[PDB]
CSV table of C-alpha atoms and ligand atoms in Angstrom, one decimal:
chain,number,residue,atom,x,y,z
A,1,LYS,CA,0.0,0.0,0.0
A,2,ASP,CA,1.0,3.6,-0.6
A,3,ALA,CA,2.0,6.6,1.6
A,4,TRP,CA,-1.6,7.7,1.9
A,5,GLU,CA,-2.3,4.9,4.5
A,6,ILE,CA,-2.7,5.7,8.2
A,7,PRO,CA,-3.2,3.6,11.3
A,8,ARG,CA,-6.8,3.3,12.5
A,9,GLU,CA,-6.0,4.5,16.1
A,10,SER,CA,-4.7,7.9,14.8
A,11,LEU,CA,-8.2,8.7,13.7
A,12,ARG,CA,-10.9,9.9,16.1
A,13,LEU,CA,-14.5,10.4,14.9
A,14,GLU,CA,-16.2,13.1,17.1
A,15,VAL,CA,-19.3,14.6,15.6
A,16,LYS,CA,-21.4,13.1,12.8
A,17,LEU,CA,-22.0,15.5,10.0
A,18,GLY,CA,-24.2,13.6,7.6
A,19,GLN,CA,-25.7,10.3,6.5
A,20,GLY,CA,-26.5,8.1,3.6
A,21,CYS,CA,-27.3,4.6,2.5
A,22,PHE,CA,-23.7,4.0,1.6
A,23,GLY,CA,-21.8,5.7,4.5
A,24,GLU,CA,-21.4,8.4,7.1
A,25,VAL,CA,-19.5,11.7,7.2
A,26,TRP,CA,-17.9,12.7,10.5
A,27,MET,CA,-15.9,15.7,11.9
A,28,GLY,CA,-12.8,14.3,13.6
A,29,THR,CA,-9.2,14.5,14.7
A,30,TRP,CA,-6.2,13.0,12.9
A,31,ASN,CA,-3.0,12.3,14.9
A,32,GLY,CA,-4.6,14.0,17.9
A,33,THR,CA,-3.8,17.5,16.5
A,34,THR,CA,-5.4,17.9,13.0
A,35,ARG,CA,-9.1,18.6,12.5
A,36,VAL,CA,-10.5,16.6,9.6
A,37,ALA,CA,-13.5,15.3,7.8
A,38,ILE,CA,-13.9,11.6,7.8
A,39,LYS,CA,-15.9,9.7,5.2
A,40,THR,CA,-16.9,6.0,6.0
A,41,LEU,CA,-18.2,3.2,3.8
A,42,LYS,CA,-20.8,0.8,5.3
A,43,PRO,CA,-19.8,-2.8,4.8
A,44,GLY,CA,-21.3,-4.7,1.8
A,45,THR,CA,-23.7,-1.9,0.8
A,46,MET,CA,-21.4,-0.9,-2.1
A,47,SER,CA,-18.3,-2.3,-3.7
A,48,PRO,CA,-15.1,-1.2,-1.9
A,49,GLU,CA,-13.4,-0.4,-5.2
A,50,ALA,CA,-16.4,1.7,-6.2
A,51,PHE,CA,-16.2,3.6,-3.0
A,52,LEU,CA,-12.4,4.1,-3.4
A,53,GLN,CA,-12.9,5.5,-6.8
A,54,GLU,CA,-13.2,9.1,-5.5
A,55,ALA,CA,-10.0,8.8,-3.4
A,56,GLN,CA,-8.0,7.6,-6.4
A,57,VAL,CA,-8.8,10.8,-8.4
A,58,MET,CA,-8.1,13.0,-5.3
A,59,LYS,CA,-4.6,11.5,-5.1
A,60,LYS,CA,-3.9,13.0,-8.5
A,61,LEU,CA,-5.5,16.5,-8.0
A,62,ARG,CA,-4.0,19.2,-5.7
A,63,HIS,CA,-5.2,22.8,-5.8
A,64,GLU,CA,-6.1,25.4,-3.2
A,65,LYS,CA,-9.7,25.4,-4.4
A,66,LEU,CA,-10.3,21.7,-4.4
A,67,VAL,CA,-11.0,19.8,-1.2
A,68,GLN,CA,-7.7,18.1,-0.3
A,69,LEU,CA,-7.3,14.4,0.5
A,70,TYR,CA,-5.2,13.8,3.7
A,71,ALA,CA,-5.3,10.1,4.3
A,72,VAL,CA,-6.9,6.8,3.6
A,73,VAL,CA,-7.7,3.5,5.4
A,74,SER,CA,-8.1,1.3,2.3
A,75,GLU,CA,-9.2,-2.1,3.7
A,76,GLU,CA,-12.7,-2.6,5.2
A,77,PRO,CA,-13.8,-0.8,7.1
A,78,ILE,CA,-12.7,1.9,4.8
A,79,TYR,CA,-12.2,5.5,5.9
A,80,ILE,CA,-11.5,8.6,3.7
A,81,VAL,CA,-9.8,11.6,5.4
A,82,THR,CA,-10.0,15.1,3.9
A,83,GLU,CA,-9.5,18.7,5.0
A,84,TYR,CA,-12.4,19.9,7.1
A,85,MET,CA,-14.7,22.6,5.7
A,86,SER,CA,-16.3,24.2,8.7
A,87,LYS,CA,-19.4,25.6,7.1
A,88,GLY,CA,-20.7,22.6,5.2
A,89,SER,CA,-22.2,22.4,1.7
A,90,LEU,CA,-22.6,25.7,-0.3
A,91,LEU,CA,-26.3,24.7,-0.9
A,92,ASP,CA,-27.0,24.5,2.8
A,93,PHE,CA,-25.0,27.7,3.4
A,94,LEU,CA,-27.0,29.7,0.9
A,95,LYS,CA,-30.3,28.4,2.2
A,96,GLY,CA,-29.5,28.8,5.9
A,97,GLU,CA,-29.2,31.7,8.4
A,98,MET,CA,-26.1,33.0,6.6
A,99,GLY,CA,-27.8,33.3,3.3
A,100,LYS,CA,-29.6,36.5,4.1
A,101,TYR,CA,-26.5,38.5,4.5
A,102,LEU,CA,-24.7,37.4,1.3
A,103,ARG,CA,-24.8,40.1,-1.4
A,104,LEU,CA,-23.6,40.1,-5.0
A,105,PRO,CA,-19.9,40.9,-4.2
A,106,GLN,CA,-19.7,37.9,-1.9
A,107,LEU,CA,-21.6,35.6,-4.3
A,108,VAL,CA,-19.4,36.5,-7.3
A,109,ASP,CA,-16.2,36.1,-5.3
A,110,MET,CA,-17.4,32.6,-4.3
A,111,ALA,CA,-18.2,32.0,-8.0
A,112,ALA,CA,-14.6,33.2,-8.9
A,113,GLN,CA,-13.1,30.7,-6.4
A,114,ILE,CA,-15.1,27.8,-7.9
A,115,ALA,CA,-14.1,28.9,-11.4
A,116,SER,CA,-10.5,28.9,-10.2
A,117,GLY,CA,-10.8,25.3,-8.9
A,118,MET,CA,-12.5,24.3,-12.2
A,119,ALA,CA,-9.8,26.1,-14.3
A,120,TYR,CA,-7.4,23.8,-12.6
A,121,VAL,CA,-9.6,20.8,-13.5
A,122,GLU,CA,-9.7,22.2,-17.1
A,123,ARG,CA,-5.9,22.6,-17.2
A,124,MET,CA,-5.5,19.0,-16.0
A,125,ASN,CA,-7.8,17.6,-18.8
A,126,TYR,CA,-10.3,16.2,-16.2
A,127,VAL,CA,-14.1,16.5,-16.2
A,128,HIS,CA,-16.1,16.6,-13.0
A,129,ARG,CA,-19.6,15.7,-14.3
A,130,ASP,CA,-21.5,16.7,-11.1
A,131,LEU,CA,-20.7,20.4,-10.5
A,132,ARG,CA,-23.5,22.0,-8.5
A,133,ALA,CA,-23.9,23.9,-5.2
A,134,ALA,CA,-24.5,20.7,-3.2
A,135,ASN,CA,-21.0,19.5,-4.3
A,136,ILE,CA,-19.2,22.7,-3.2
A,137,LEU,CA,-17.9,23.0,0.4
A,138,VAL,CA,-17.5,26.2,2.4
A,139,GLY,CA,-14.9,27.1,5.0
A,140,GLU,CA,-13.9,30.1,7.1
A,141,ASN,CA,-13.7,33.5,5.5
A,142,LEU,CA,-16.1,32.4,2.7
A,143,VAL,CA,-13.6,30.0,1.2
A,144,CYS,CA,-15.2,27.8,-1.4
A,145,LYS,CA,-13.8,24.5,-2.7
A,146,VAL,CA,-14.9,22.0,-5.3
A,147,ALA,CA,-15.7,18.5,-3.8
A,148,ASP,CA,-17.2,15.1,-4.6
A,149,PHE,CA,-15.0,13.8,-7.5
A,150,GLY,CA,-16.8,10.4,-7.3
A,151,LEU,CA,-17.8,10.8,-11.0
A,152,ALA,CA,-14.7,12.8,-12.2
A,153,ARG,CA,-12.5,11.2,-14.9
A,154,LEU,CA,-10.1,11.9,-17.7
A,155,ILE,CA,-11.2,12.6,-21.3
A,156,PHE,CA,-27.5,12.4,-13.6
A,157,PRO,CA,-29.6,15.3,-12.4
A,158,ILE,CA,-31.0,16.8,-15.6
A,159,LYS,CA,-31.4,20.3,-14.3
A,160,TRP,CA,-27.7,20.7,-13.9
A,161,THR,CA,-26.5,18.6,-16.8
A,162,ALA,CA,-25.9,19.9,-20.3
A,163,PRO,CA,-28.3,18.5,-22.9
A,164,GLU,CA,-25.6,16.8,-25.0
A,165,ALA,CA,-24.3,15.0,-21.9
A,166,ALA,CA,-27.7,14.0,-20.6
A,167,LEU,CA,-29.0,12.8,-24.0
A,168,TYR,CA,-25.9,11.4,-25.7
A,169,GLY,CA,-23.4,10.8,-22.8
A,170,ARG,CA,-21.2,13.6,-24.2
A,171,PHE,CA,-19.4,14.7,-20.9
A,172,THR,CA,-16.6,17.3,-21.5
A,173,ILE,CA,-15.1,20.2,-19.6
A,174,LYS,CA,-17.7,22.2,-21.6
A,175,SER,CA,-20.6,20.3,-20.0
A,176,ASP,CA,-19.1,21.3,-16.7
A,177,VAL,CA,-19.2,24.9,-18.0
A,178,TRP,CA,-22.9,24.4,-18.6
A,179,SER,CA,-23.3,23.1,-15.0
A,180,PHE,CA,-21.4,26.2,-13.7
A,181,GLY,CA,-24.0,28.4,-15.4
A,182,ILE,CA,-26.7,26.6,-13.4
A,183,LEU,CA,-24.5,27.0,-10.3
A,184,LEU,CA,-24.5,30.8,-10.9
A,185,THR,CA,-28.3,30.8,-10.7
A,186,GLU,CA,-28.2,28.8,-7.4
A,187,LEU,CA,-25.8,31.5,-6.0
A,188,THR,CA,-27.9,34.4,-7.1
A,189,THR,CA,-31.2,32.9,-5.9
A,190,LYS,CA,-29.8,31.8,-2.5
A,191,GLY,CA,-30.0,28.1,-3.3
A,192,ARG,CA,-33.3,27.7,-5.0
A,193,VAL,CA,-33.8,24.6,-7.2
A,194,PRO,CA,-33.3,25.7,-10.9
A,195,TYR,CA,-36.3,25.7,-13.3
A,196,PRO,CA,-38.9,26.4,-10.6
A,197,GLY,CA,-42.1,24.4,-11.0
A,198,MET,CA,-40.8,22.3,-13.8
A,199,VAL,CA,-40.3,18.6,-13.5
A,200,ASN,CA,-37.4,16.8,-15.2
A,201,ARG,CA,-39.3,15.9,-18.4
A,202,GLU,CA,-40.4,19.4,-19.1
A,203,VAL,CA,-36.9,20.6,-18.4
A,204,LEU,CA,-35.4,18.3,-21.0
A,205,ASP,CA,-38.1,19.2,-23.5
A,206,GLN,CA,-37.9,22.9,-22.9
A,207,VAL,CA,-34.1,23.3,-23.0
A,208,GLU,CA,-33.9,21.5,-26.3
A,209,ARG,CA,-36.6,23.8,-27.6
A,210,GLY,CA,-34.3,26.8,-26.7
A,211,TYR,CA,-35.7,27.7,-23.2
A,212,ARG,CA,-33.2,29.2,-20.8
A,213,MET,CA,-33.8,30.5,-17.2
A,214,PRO,CA,-34.5,34.3,-17.1
A,215,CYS,CA,-32.4,36.8,-15.2
A,216,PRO,CA,-33.0,36.3,-11.4
A,217,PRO,CA,-34.5,39.3,-9.6
A,218,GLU,CA,-31.8,41.9,-8.7
A,219,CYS,CA,-29.2,40.0,-10.7
A,220,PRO,CA,-27.4,42.4,-13.2
A,221,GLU,CA,-28.1,41.5,-16.8
A,222,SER,CA,-24.3,41.2,-17.4
A,223,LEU,CA,-24.1,38.3,-15.0
A,224,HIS,CA,-27.2,36.7,-16.6
A,225,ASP,CA,-25.5,37.1,-20.0
A,226,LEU,CA,-22.5,35.1,-18.6
A,227,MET,CA,-25.0,32.3,-17.6
A,228,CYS,CA,-26.4,32.3,-21.2
A,229,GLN,CA,-22.9,31.9,-22.6
A,230,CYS,CA,-22.4,28.8,-20.4
A,231,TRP,CA,-25.7,27.6,-21.8
A,232,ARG,CA,-25.0,27.9,-25.5
A,233,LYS,CA,-26.4,24.9,-27.4
A,234,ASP,CA,-23.0,24.4,-29.1
A,235,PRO,CA,-20.6,23.2,-26.4
A,236,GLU,CA,-17.6,24.5,-28.2
A,237,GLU,CA,-19.0,28.1,-28.1
A,238,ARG,CA,-19.2,28.1,-24.3
A,239,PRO,CA,-16.4,30.0,-22.5
A,240,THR,CA,-13.5,28.4,-20.7
A,241,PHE,CA,-13.1,28.3,-17.0
A,242,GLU,CA,-10.0,30.3,-17.5
A,243,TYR,CA,-12.2,33.0,-19.1
A,244,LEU,CA,-14.9,32.6,-16.4
A,245,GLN,CA,-12.3,33.0,-13.6
A,246,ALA,CA,-10.9,36.2,-15.0
A,247,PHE,CA,-14.3,37.7,-15.7
A,248,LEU,CA,-15.6,37.0,-12.2
A,249,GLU,CA,-12.4,38.2,-10.4
A,250,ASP,CA,-12.5,41.5,-12.3
A,251,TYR,CA,-16.4,41.8,-12.3
A,252,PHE,CA,-16.9,44.9,-10.2
A,253,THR,CA,-14.3,47.0,-11.9
A,254,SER,CA,-14.5,45.9,-15.5
A,255,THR,CA,-18.1,44.9,-16.0
A,256,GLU,CA,-20.3,46.5,-13.2
A,257,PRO,CA,-18.4,49.5,-12.0
A,258,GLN,CA,-21.7,51.2,-11.0
A,259,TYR,CA,-23.1,48.3,-9.0
A,260,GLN,CA,-25.1,49.4,-5.9
A,261,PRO,CA,-26.3,47.1,-3.1
A,262,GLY,CA,-30.0,46.1,-3.1
A,263,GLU,CA,-32.3,44.2,-0.7
A,264,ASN,CA,-31.2,40.7,-1.6
A,265,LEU,CA,-28.3,41.1,-4.1
B,1,LIG,N1,-14.7,17.9,3.8
B,1,LIG,C1,-15.9,18.2,4.6
B,1,LIG,N2,-15.8,19.0,5.6
B,1,LIG,C2,-16.9,19.3,6.3
B,1,LIG,N3,-18.1,18.8,6.1
B,1,LIG,C3,-18.3,17.9,5.1
B,1,LIG,C4,-17.1,17.6,4.3
B,1,LIG,N4,-17.6,16.6,3.3
B,1,LIG,C5,-19.0,16.5,3.5
B,1,LIG,N5,-19.2,17.2,4.5
B,1,LIG,C6,-20.5,17.3,5.1
B,1,LIG,O1,-21.2,16.0,5.0
B,1,LIG,C7,-22.5,16.2,4.2
B,1,LIG,C8,-22.7,15.1,3.2
B,1,LIG,O2,-21.4,14.7,2.6
B,1,LIG,P1,-21.3,14.3,1.1
B,1,LIG,O3,-19.9,14.0,0.6
B,1,LIG,O4,-21.7,15.4,0.2
B,1,LIG,C9,-22.4,12.8,0.8
B,1,LIG,CL1,-21.7,11.4,1.6
B,1,LIG,P2,-22.4,12.4,-1.0
B,1,LIG,O5,-21.1,11.9,-1.6
B,1,LIG,O6,-22.8,13.6,-1.9
B,1,LIG,O7,-23.4,11.4,-1.4
B,1,LIG,C10,-22.3,17.5,3.5
B,1,LIG,O8,-23.6,18.2,3.4
B,1,LIG,C11,-21.3,18.3,4.3
B,1,LIG,O9,-22.1,19.2,5.2
B,2,LIG,MG1,-22.6,16.2,-1.6
């Protein structure tokens, strides 16, 4: 086994953070000094090598805006140890008590961080395939990091998935760019489900017919125009994450220098 392995007694699971049919997520301590997130797999509910799939990708990716793998216990019972993100999922964050104070400058900076993490994914010729607010983690000082690479690979919820990927299995970094556009609407609506009042079948039907979500209330048209670029029918016409990162970093000087705060954004 490799250098990622740790002894089981160096890990202490303290507070349970979440649940599932396939495992648990705990806040804990590693080597008695390091605060960590610990992911477990429940015996014989899923294949051990299917559970380890996410860890294998995380071994190859290292970037300040991706959740970092720390250690692994690779024989059953399996544990996955990652950096601890104190504020939980971006989706929960946006929906909860802290949502009501976030304004456009915070939300756009969070989008810029996510674009930076995805620009690294882009540079590395990887695809994520499940980019959405539920798979972003939030830390102190509004730090946002991309997580859940369980489906990530080298070169599905229809509301976040590009049509060519959902229909024809065409997953590329450009279908992740599509998903990022949907993530931007989650950020600017404080975590609302996209395409409100539409079930999956209408969504499929409508998007192929040319329907796109309108500009969210109090969202500048220029930011909605960025969403529409991410949602171009032709995947090759969508911007790069490199472009998206630069656009969002410079947004309040180059694109909306006359922004003024409103009631919600
Ligand atoms: N590195 C981390 N630091 C802090 N909290 C984390 C964390 N990873 C997950 N959590 C929390 O545990 C919850 C569920 O975890 P999860 O990884 O998203 C599902 Cl198992 P999933 O793989 O999607 O099926 C999240 O809502 C987070 O709230
Ligand atoms: Mg998740």
